[PDB]
Design a protein around this motif. Structure first.
Motif, PDB file in Angstrom:
ATOM      1  N   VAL A 180      90.969 -26.914 -34.137  1.00  0.00           N
ATOM      2  CA  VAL A 180      89.819 -26.845 -34.794  1.00  0.00           C
ATOM      3  C   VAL A 180      89.222 -28.048 -34.934  1.00  0.00           C
ATOM      4  O   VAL A 180      88.104 -27.989 -35.358  1.00  0.00           O
ATOM      5  CB  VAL A 180      90.147 -25.972 -36.323  1.00  0.00           C
ATOM      6  N   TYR A 181      90.105 -28.967 -35.272  1.00  0.00           N
ATOM      7  CA  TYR A 181      89.461 -30.610 -35.539  1.00  0.00           C
ATOM      8  C   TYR A 181      88.543 -31.008 -34.494  1.00  0.00           C
ATOM      9  O   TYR A 181      87.420 -31.770 -34.547  1.00  0.00           O
ATOM     10  CB  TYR A 181      90.686 -31.452 -35.979  1.00  0.00           C
ATOM     11  N   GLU A 182      89.050 -30.527 -33.196  1.00  0.00           N
ATOM     12  CA  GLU A 182      88.266 -31.001 -31.901  1.00  0.00           C
ATOM     13  C   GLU A 182      86.873 -30.263 -31.743  1.00  0.00           C
ATOM     14  O   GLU A 182      86.032 -30.800 -31.457  1.00  0.00           O
ATOM     15  CB  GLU A 182      89.166 -31.235 -30.745  1.00  0.00           C
ATOM     16  N   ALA A 183      87.202 -28.900 -31.827  1.00  0.00           N
ATOM     17  CA  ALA A 183      85.971 -27.978 -31.584  1.00  0.00           C
ATOM     18  C   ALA A 183      85.087 -28.002 -32.644  1.00  0.00           C
ATOM     19  O   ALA A 183      83.770 -27.986 -32.487  1.00  0.00           O
ATOM     20  CB  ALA A 183      86.699 -26.642 -31.332  1.00  0.00           C
ATOM     21  N   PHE A 184      85.482 -28.122 -33.892  1.00  0.00           N
ATOM     22  CA  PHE A 184      84.575 -27.952 -35.022  1.00  0.00           C
ATOM     23  C   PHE A 184      84.923 -28.905 -36.314  1.00  0.00           C
ATOM     24  O   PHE A 184      85.471 -28.678 -37.099  1.00  0.00           O
ATOM     25  CB  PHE A 184      84.850 -26.434 -35.511  1.00  0.00           C
ATOM     26  N   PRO A 185      84.683 -30.258 -35.685  1.00  0.00           N
ATOM     27  CA  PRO A 185      85.072 -31.293 -36.748  1.00  0.00           C
ATOM     28  C   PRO A 185      84.446 -31.139 -38.217  1.00  0.00           C
ATOM     29  O   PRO A 185      84.988 -31.904 -38.862  1.00  0.00           O
ATOM     30  CB  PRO A 185      84.420 -32.478 -35.942  1.00  0.00           C
ATOM     31  N   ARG A 186      83.241 -30.720 -38.406  1.00  0.00           N
ATOM     32  CA  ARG A 186      82.853 -30.508 -39.626  1.00  0.00           C
ATOM     33  C   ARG A 186      82.799 -29.146 -40.107  1.00  0.00           C
ATOM     34  O   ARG A 186      82.196 -28.847 -41.307  1.00  0.00           O
ATOM     35  CB  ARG A 186      81.356 -30.900 -39.667  1.00  0.00           C
ATOM     36  N   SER A 187      83.641 -28.098 -39.841  1.00  0.00           N
ATOM     37  CA  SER A 187      84.135 -26.959 -40.497  1.00  0.00           C
ATOM     38  C   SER A 187      85.012 -27.471 -41.685  1.00  0.00           C
ATOM     39  O   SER A 187      85.393 -28.499 -41.831  1.00  0.00           O
ATOM     40  CB  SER A 187      84.691 -26.254 -39.540  1.00  0.00           C
ATOM     41  N   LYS A 188      84.970 -26.465 -42.599  1.00  0.00           N
ATOM     42  CA  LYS A 188      85.794 -26.885 -43.773  1.00  0.00           C
ATOM     43  C   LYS A 188      87.069 -27.165 -43.601  1.00  0.00           C
ATOM     44  O   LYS A 188      87.725 -28.119 -44.346  1.00  0.00           O
ATOM     45  CB  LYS A 188      85.647 -25.846 -44.956  1.00  0.00           C
ATOM     46  N   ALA A 189      87.818 -26.499 -42.775  1.00  0.00           N
ATOM     47  CA  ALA A 189      89.264 -26.773 -42.519  1.00  0.00           C
ATOM     48  C   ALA A 189      89.166 -28.300 -41.768  1.00  0.00           C
ATOM     49  O   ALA A 189      90.333 -29.023 -42.198  1.00  0.00           O
ATOM     50  CB  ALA A 189      89.791 -25.698 -41.659  1.00  0.00           C
ATOM     51  N   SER A 190      88.353 -28.367 -41.009  1.00  0.00           N
ATOM     52  CA  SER A 190      88.601 -29.859 -40.271  1.00  0.00           C
ATOM     53  C   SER A 190      88.180 -30.947 -41.239  1.00  0.00           C
ATOM     54  O   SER A 190      88.901 -32.099 -41.251  1.00  0.00           O
ATOM     55  CB  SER A 190      87.690 -29.954 -39.158  1.00  0.00           C
ATOM     56  N   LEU A 191      87.311 -30.866 -42.117  1.00  0.00           N
ATOM     57  CA  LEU A 191      86.952 -31.785 -43.225  1.00  0.00           C
ATOM     58  C   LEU A 191      88.348 -31.754 -44.109  1.00  0.00           C
ATOM     59  O   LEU A 191      88.659 -33.014 -44.587  1.00  0.00           O
ATOM     60  CB  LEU A 191      85.838 -31.444 -44.249  1.00  0.00           C
ATOM     61  N   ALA A 192      88.934 -30.923 -44.293  1.00  0.00           N
ATOM     62  CA  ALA A 192      90.148 -30.939 -45.174  1.00  0.00           C
ATOM     63  C   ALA A 192      91.136 -31.862 -44.233  1.00  0.00           C
ATOM     64  O   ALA A 192      91.989 -32.694 -44.955  1.00  0.00           O
ATOM     65  CB  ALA A 192      90.725 -29.743 -45.497  1.00  0.00           C
ATOM     66  N   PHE A 193      91.254 -31.496 -42.987  1.00  0.00           N
ATOM     67  CA  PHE A 193      92.109 -32.555 -42.370  1.00  0.00           C
ATOM     68  C   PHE A 193      91.890 -33.865 -42.361  1.00  0.00           C
ATOM     69  O   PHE A 193      92.716 -34.666 -42.099  1.00  0.00           O
ATOM     70  CB  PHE A 193      92.270 -32.109 -40.729  1.00  0.00           C
ATOM     71  N   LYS A 194      90.543 -34.180 -42.190  1.00  0.00           N
ATOM     72  CA  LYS A 194      90.142 -35.444 -42.355  1.00  0.00           C
ATOM     73  C   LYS A 194      90.665 -36.235 -43.601  1.00  0.00           C
ATOM     74  O   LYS A 194      91.101 -37.259 -43.698  1.00  0.00           O
ATOM     75  CB  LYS A 194      88.634 -35.844 -42.233  1.00  0.00           C
TER      76      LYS A 194
END
Length: 262
Positions: A219-233
């Motif tokens: 998800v971080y690679e495919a959708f870096p600004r989705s809510k889950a990816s922002l949480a991983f950041k």
């Protein structure tokens, strides 16, 4: 300047791969990262499926090949070392095997900032978890998640002297649900153990995760600004703030030292 940070991630693979996404998020912050694949449970099924990598870390320790010969590329180009095929005890190594182990981790350490160890086995895995500088326990809303997390803390505490654990709530539908999960684990460990839990936070439930999974992407690679990816950041930001190993920068000697004793 900085020693290599080593984080073991336990749990969290709802298909949601925390180690891969943490590694990608760390890289996105400019850290040089590598993954160590230590999922024994997965490896055992893979053997029957002819899915074992041609070469693994065990082959490097036995001096059959070099570390660079076993590296795989995963999502977003993260480098992966297969490390779930060891049949040998890290405490019964020959001098030749010990030298191969030193060599493997020297090579892993080159230009590296963070090693993320991915695990899923209660062994030849646990060595990597015990030796890690920080353990990240991933917990979710599934009925047995909290008790599985507890049983793991109990084991690491009792059998491997570990006394501090990071806790991440995965795919929580609200901050309150994540807090409840941590509150439950704290209450239980408070009663029976003398350990220190620290609540990292929540990776929010996010439809983008399934969407990424169905595309065979992180998800971080495919959708870096989705809510889950922002949480991983944000998790990655917290992670770079955890204390480093208490030694000057070397070539992962401290980790190898922990693997073979303690």
């Amino acid at each position: 300047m900085h020693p290599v940070q080593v984080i073991a991630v336990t749990g969290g693979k709802g298909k949601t791969n925390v180690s891969v996404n943490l590694a990608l998020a760390l890289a996105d912050l400019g850290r040089r990262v590598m993954l160590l694949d230590a999922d024994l449970g997965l490896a055992n099924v893979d053997v029957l499926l002819g899915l074992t990598p041609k070469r693994t870390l065990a082959d490097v320790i036995e001096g059959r090949c070099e570390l660079r010969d076993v590296l795989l590329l995963g999502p977003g180009g993260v480098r992966i070392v297969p490390a779930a095929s060891g049949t040998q005890s890290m405490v019964h190594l020959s001098p030749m095997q010990h030298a191969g182990l030193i060599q493997a981790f020297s090579d892993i350490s080159d230009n590296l900032d963070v090693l993320v160890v991915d695990t899923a086995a209660g062994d030849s895995v646990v060595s990597f978890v015990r030796a890690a500088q920080e353990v990240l326990l991933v917990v979710c809303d599934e009925p047995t998640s909290i008790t599985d997390a507890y049983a793991l803390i109990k084991l690491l505490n009792r059998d491997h002297g570990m006394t501090r654990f990071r806790v991440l709530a995965n795919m929580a539908h609200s901050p309150q649900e994540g807090r409840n999960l941590f509150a439950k684990l704290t209450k239980v460990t408070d009663r029976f153990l003398d350990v220190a839990l620290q609540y990292v936070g929540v990776i929010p439930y996010d439809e983008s995760v399934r969407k990424a999974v169905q595309k065979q992407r992180a998800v971080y690679e495919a959708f870096p600004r989705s809510k889950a990816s922002l949480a991983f950041k944000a998790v990655a930001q917290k992670v770079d703030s955890w204390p480093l190993p208490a030694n000057p920068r070397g070539h992962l000697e401290f980790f190898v030292e922990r693997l073979v004793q303690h």
